[PDB]
A paper describes a structure:
TRPM8 is a multimodal sensor of innocuous-to-noxious cold that is activated by several factors, such as temperature, cooling agents (e.g., menthol and icilin), voltage, pressure, and osmolality. TRPM8 is a non-selective cation channel permeable to both monovalent and divalent cations that is activated by multiple factors, such as temperature, voltage, pressure, and changes in osmolality. TRPM8 has attracted great interest because of the therapeutic applications of its modulators that can be utilized for several pathological conditions, including neuropathic pain, irritable bowel syndrome, oropharyngeal dysphagia, chronic cough, and hypertension. At 2.7 Å resolution, it is one of the two highest-resolution structures of any TRPM8 protein that is currently available. Overall, human TRPM8 adopts a characteristic homotetrameric arrangement and is very similar to previously described TRPM8 structures.
We determined a cryo-EM structure of apo HsTRPM8 that was solubilized with lauryl maltose neopentyl glycol (LMNG) and cholesteryl hemisuccinate (CHS). By combining a high-resolution global map with focused refinement maps of N-terminal domains, we were able to build an atomic model of human TRPM8 (HsTRPM8) that comprises residues 43–1104. The pore is composed of helices S5 and S6 connected with a pore helix (PH). The lower gate of the channel is formed by hydrophobic side chains of M978 and F979 (both shown in Fig. 2a as sticks) that close the pore. In contrast, in our reconstruction, only the first two amino acids from the selectivity filter (F912 and G913) are resolved. The conformation of the pore in our structure is similar to the closed C0 MmTRPM812. In our structure, the S4-S5 linker is parallel to the S5 helix, and the S4 helix is fully α-helical. The quality of our EM map in this region allowed us to unambiguously assign them to two CHS molecules and a phospholipid with one monounsaturated fatty acid which we modeled as phosphatidylcholine (POPC). In summary, additional densities visible in our HsTRPM8 (and other published structures) can be interpreted as compounds copurifying with the protein (PE/POPC, Na+) or used for its solubilization (CHS), but we cannot be sure about their identity and source, and thus interpret their physiological relevance. Importantly, we did not observe any density in the putative Ca2+-binding pocket between the S2 and S3 helices that could be assigned to the divalent ion, which further confirms that our structure is not in the desensitized state. To improve the quality of the reconstruction of this region we performed its focused refinement, followed by C4 symmetry expansion and subtraction of the signal from the rest of the TRPM8 molecule.
Residue numbers in the entry:
A (entry chain A): 145 to 229, 235 to 240
B (entry chain D): 961 to 984, 990 to 1030, 1049 to 1056
C (entry chain D): 433 to 533, 557 to 716, 722 to 891, 895 to 912
D (entry chain A): 865 to 891, 895 to 913, 952 to 984, 990 to 1008
E (entry chain A): 577 to 624
F (entry chain A): 481 to 528
């Protein structure tokens, strides 16, 4: 289990950090690991989600990547759509 | 003398024909191979002489009338 | 800091986690980095949250192509369009005209940087494109076309160098793609979109004469798979030939196939294979030559016997194939001097049929027989050429193709000398324009041979 | 091998030439086959609109056969010590294994 | 393979047999990447 | 200090060749045996 707790916003996409986090996600996929980040679509978490999506696209037959996003319900922007009217929430 | 001159010029042309390909490696012949094989593979691929029916059908028709790959790349 | 190209200072001070900024806050700074050729700052702004797709609006592209486009580059593009026009050149000219007076804005910006030989800016923009192999191949084609203009040889040399760089980039990216996946890379190979004129990776590589891209092992084995069709390349060639001669053996599992299906799909996949079709066509051509010889030697009695009508139908299908080749290849078909030979042989067969149909005339029948014999020689020459090409289908095809043209030129020069020799002989031996011309043309050939 | 292929192509052309000669000069399947096979070999080694195409087809045949001969002469150079050493070992070991 | 080959008894014979087997496996055109890897390994063991 | 000769028992080799042998590799080996068969290829196929 990897608990990624980094910058919540304004993350520079430097090649060194890009390679570091791509390797981290590759290790998590290879080891069957869980990545615990925040659910916000900002900064490091956005890049982690992008890398997870890229890995799933590239290797569909490999083990799935679990990327749990632990966020705050009180900070979600487009709410009132996550409430139930089986049910799919369109965020 | 003119027989000798004609022999000289014609023989030199023949020798140029023999030796000219050496003046000017794998990529060139691979490109030519692709050109020829793709030219033949782009046909209707119907055995002769049954291709005439395909030609007639094609002329009759003429007279009558993605993101996943990009993401992976 | 951007005006002085101080990227390290900007990274150390301006762009820090302590400070805050938005993607839309650096739109104008991105524009002035683009127009002042600051590729490092373009990359910095791109990797610092700015979205290029939304920034590249129609107004931005129009301003880039109207006010920040070099007049020398536009003159070179106009000269290329007038002198070395092509499908991709026409597409790029239309795009430039549109932006001077989806839509793929990133492709437009990539073309804007490519036409002006902004190598590093072009690389930065290309790293953001969607179809990257297609973009690299299209850039290679466009740059090779622009290198043909001799108005400025330094600009042409820069264009040639950039074209080679982008061809190498496409080769490396596709090699990575093929090493990763084989089916996905082959799907990407034939992927077509209106982005580069509706063209294709293979089509763009062939048009640009990108020999390095075509000579890739992935491209070559893709071509081999196309050549074998649904038949797996692991089967032996003699097995395929034997199943061609023994048709029922195709459904008995003798020939292995790449995929699986009904006992009819097997025969359809076998007989639609270009390898099988080629072999069958050669075999049927040999059979047609045998029938032609039989008709010439034993079936010429001043009337069309059923073998004669069968031969006429076979020649008709050959003529249909030649007409299809004409339509497909345009005017470039009559350049090989061997396609011209096939066309002339078919025309000679038509003339011989016309002469032969005039029955009750010994002269017409003899002329038809002579024409048919000459056409038999022509058809066997075509078969010999097919055998020669198939034998040397490899590294020796370059030598063969060069030698054909070179020997043809030597024979033309010998024919010119023979005409001179015949003129000299007629002026020395003899003292009727048609008779004089006939003697001049046909005296040296009969005398020396 | 290259000269053998060139000679095979020349034999095919000779068969075509014999067929053409028999169809032009002459009018018995065994006799026809014998004439077709043995006429050009003995001939070479022992009418207004047909002369120009005859010269043209002679030129084309010369071109293709000469190109095949030149390919025979030059094809070994397309495609160093290890290769001929392997061939030498193959031949000498084949004879030494008797 | 190199680690295991360093422990074999007949090492030249093992290297030559590996070269032969890898060259045979490189003839299969089902997967050209695997065939290329086999050819490279065959060349390596021939050199060894 | 580990001895490879004694470690490589029949059970270990069977487990390696049965459970830890790639199916793609086995398919390629089968294709080679069917199409490019040889004495060494036959020997290796029998061993596998
Ligand atoms: C005028 C009277 C009528 C006409 C009569 C004329 C009679 C003419 C009748 C027959 C002669 C045909 C000659 C064809 C030669 C050209 C082909 C060639 O050289 O390449 C082939 C030679 O391998 C063969 O195709 C061998 C053919 C042997 C035929 C034996 C006699 C059959 C009867 C194969 O080349 P390759 O390099 O092995 O192919 C690549 C291999 N790969 C795909 C696995 C990578
Ligand atoms: C008459 C037909 C019936 C079956 C035919 C044969 C079927 C198979 C072959 C194998 C074929 O060999 C290859 O194509 C091998 C090519 C290679 O491996 O290089 C040559 C023609 C030949 C002898 C055919 C010659 C003409 C034959 C005897
Ligand atoms: C009717 C009787 C006399 C038998 C005649 C047999 C020939 C017409 C056949 C037998 C084997 C065939 C050949 C078998 C294999 C090949 C390889 C094949 O692949 C290529 O060379 C394509 C280019 C490449 O893939 O590198 C091209 C056709 C060719 C020469 C075939 C051409 C037609 C051949 C000579
Ligand atoms: C008329 C003078 C001829 C001199 C000898 C020419 C020999 C040419 C040999 C070409 C192979
Ligand atoms: C029937 C036309 C012949 C032209 C001259 C051919 C010369 C070939 C020389 C080969 C060494
Ligand atoms: Na002379
Ligand atoms: Na001469
Ligand atoms: Na001749
Ligand atoms: Na000749």
């Amino acid at each position: 289990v990897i608990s990624v707790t980094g910058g919540a916003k304004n993350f520079a996409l430097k090649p060194r950090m890009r390679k570091i986090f791509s390797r981290l996600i590759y290790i998590a996929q290879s080891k069957g690991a869980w990545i615990l980040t925040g659910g916000t679509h900002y900064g490091l978490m956005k890049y982690i989600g992008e890398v997870v999506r890229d890995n799933t696209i590239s290797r569909s037959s490999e083990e799935n990547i679990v990327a749990i996003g632990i966020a705050a319900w009180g900070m979600v922007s487009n709410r009132d759509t996550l409430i139930r009217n089986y049910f799919l929430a369109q965020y | 003398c003119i027989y000798m001159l004609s022999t000289n010029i014609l023989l030199v042309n023949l020798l140029v024909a023999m030796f000219g390909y050496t003046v000017g490696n794998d990529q060139v012949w691979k490109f030519q191979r692709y050109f020829l094989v793709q030219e033949y593979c782009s046909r209707l691929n119907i055995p002769f002489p049954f291709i005439v029916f395909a030609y007639f059908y094609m002329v009759v028709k003429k007279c009558f009338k993605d993101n996943e790959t990009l993401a992976w790349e | 800091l951007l005006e002085w190209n101080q990227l390290d200072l900007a990274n150390d001070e301006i762009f820090t986690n302590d400070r805050r900024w938005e993607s839309a806050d650096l739109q104008e700074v991105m524009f002035t980095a683009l127009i002042k050729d600051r590729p490092k700052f373009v990359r910095l702004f791109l990797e610092n949250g700015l979205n290029l797709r939304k920034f590249l609006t129609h107004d931005v592209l129009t301003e880039l192509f109207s006010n920040h486009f070099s007049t020398l580059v536009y003159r070179n593009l106009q000269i290329a369009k007038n002198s070395y026009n092509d499908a991709l050149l026409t597409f790029v000219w239309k795009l430039v005209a549109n932006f001077r007076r989806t839509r793929h804005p990133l492709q437009a910006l990539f073309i804007w940087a490519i036409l002006q030989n902004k190598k590093e800016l072009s690389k930065v923009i290309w790293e953001q494109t969607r179809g990257c192999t297609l973009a690299a191949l299209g850039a290679s084609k466009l740059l090779k076309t622009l290198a043909k203009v001799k108005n400025d040889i330094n600009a042409a040399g820069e264009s040639e160098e950039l074209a080679n760089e982008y061809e190498t980039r496409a080769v490396e990216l596709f090699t990575e793609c093929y090493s990763s996946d084989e089916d996905l890379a082959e799907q990407l190979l034939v992927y077509s979109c209106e982005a580069w004129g509706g063209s294709n990776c293979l089509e763009l590589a062939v048009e640009a004469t990108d020999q390095h891209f075509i000579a890739q092992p992935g491209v070559q084995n893709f071509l081999s798979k196309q050549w074998y069709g649904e038949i797996s390349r692991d089967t032996k060639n003699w097995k395929i030939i034997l199943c061609l001669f023994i048709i029922p053996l195709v459904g008995c599992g003798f020939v292995s196939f790449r995929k699986k299906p009904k006992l009819l799909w097997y025969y359809v996949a076998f007989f639609t294979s270009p390898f099988v079709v080629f072999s069958w066509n050669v075999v049927f051509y040999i059979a047609f030559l045998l029938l032609f010889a039989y008709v010439l030697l034993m079936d010429f009695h001043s009337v069309p016997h059923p073998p004669e009508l069968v031969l006429y139908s076979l020649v008709f299908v050959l003529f249909c194939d030649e007409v299809r080749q004409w339509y497909v290849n345009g005017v470039n078909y009559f350049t090989d001097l061997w396609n011209v030979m096939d066309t002339l042989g078919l025309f000679y067969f038509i003339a011989g049929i016309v002469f032969r149909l005039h029955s009750s005339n010994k002269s017409s029948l003899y002329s038809g027989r002579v024409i048919f014999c000459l056409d038999y020689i022509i058809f066997t020459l075509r078969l010999i050429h097919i055998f020669t090409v198939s034998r040397n289908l490899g590294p020796k095809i370059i030598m063969l193709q060069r030698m054909l043209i070179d020997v043809f030129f030597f024979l033309f020069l010998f024919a010119v000398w023979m005409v001179a020799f015949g003129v000299a002989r007629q002026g020395i031996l003899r003292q009727r324009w048609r008779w004089i011309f006939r003697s001049v043309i046909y005296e040296p050939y009969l005398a020396m041979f | 091998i290259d000269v053998f292929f060139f000679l095979f192509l020349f034999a095919v052309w000779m068969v075509a030439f014999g067929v053409a000669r028999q169809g032009i000069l002459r009018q018995r399947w065994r006799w026809i086959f014998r004439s077709v096979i043995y006429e050009p070999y003995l001939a070479m080694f022992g009418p207004e609109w047909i002369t120009i195409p005859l010269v043209c087809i002679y030129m084309l045949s010369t071109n293709i056969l000469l190109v095949n001969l030149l390919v025979a002469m030059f094809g070994y150079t397309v495609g160093n010590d290890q290769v001929w050493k392997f061939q030498r070992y193959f031949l000498v070991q084949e004879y030494c294994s008797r």
